[PDB]
């Protein structure tokens, strides 16, 4: 019935995933009066805000060595390579990551919960990417790719189709990018927050995974 949910999440979840979860959660009559406050940020900022209880729940990347935090699979993304339409790689439709070795990257900053996965991909193929600059949020990244300031590896998100960039699928190496519903282990959680948590986990299994 009544209550508030403070939900923090990583940037790319704002465009479609969180709205879809909230829309479907709230069509149930007994959820109409539940309210939210929504916070956006990078995984490394979000984890402290879970521990200090600013957030009831979070949607973010998995983080190693956080035994106080429960990470439960919610959705997934596809990593792609994004280049300006004039770039030499734009002639291709798919590439191996090692094919990018010569080119300057717009790289995610260390705050990004994506960097463990990305770094492991480059380590797997023994490539040390040329990093031209760092950015945290995704629209700033594709913005810089669109003026050919560099290339990037990033999640395939709907906005990429609206910049003057070519999106390339990655053949090798292989990857899965999972996104998690994160919460404090052994912690008291309000009835509304628990209702949203269970709802979102069911929804992700049925529709996202």
């Amino acid at each position: 019935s009544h209550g508030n949910i403070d939900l923090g999440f990583i940037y790319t979840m704002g465009a479609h995933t969180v709205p879809e979860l909230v829309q479907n959660f709230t069509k149930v009559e007994s959820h109409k009066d539940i309210t939210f406050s929504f916070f956006q940020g990078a995984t490394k900022s979000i984890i402290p805000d879970l521990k200090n209880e600013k957030f009831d729940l979070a949607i973010c990347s998995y983080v190693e060595n956080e035994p106080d935090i429960e990470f439960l699979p919610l959705t997934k993304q596809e990593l792609v390579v994004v280049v300006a339409e004039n770039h030499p790689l734009a002639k291709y439709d798919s590439i191996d990551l090692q094919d990018t070795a010569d080119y300057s990257y717009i790289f995610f900053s260390d705050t990004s919960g994506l960097r463990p996965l990305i770094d492991s991909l480059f380590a797997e193929i023994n490539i040390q990417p040329k990093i031209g600059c760092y950015v945290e949020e995704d629209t700033a990244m594709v913005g810089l790719v669109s003026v050919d300031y560099g290339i990037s590896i990033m999640p395939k998100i709907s906005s990429l189709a609206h910049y003057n960039v070519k999106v390339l699928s990655i053949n090798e190496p292989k990857h899965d990018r999972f996104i998690y519903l994160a919460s404090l282990k052994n912690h008291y959680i309000s009835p509304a927050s628990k209702a949203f948590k269970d709802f979102a986990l069911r929804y992700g299994k049925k529709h996202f995974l």
Partner: peptide, 9 residues
């Protein structure tokens, strides 16, 4: 389907 896979670390 991918839920189980997502639990592996």
């Amino acid at each position: 389907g991918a839920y189980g896979a997502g639990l592996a670390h």
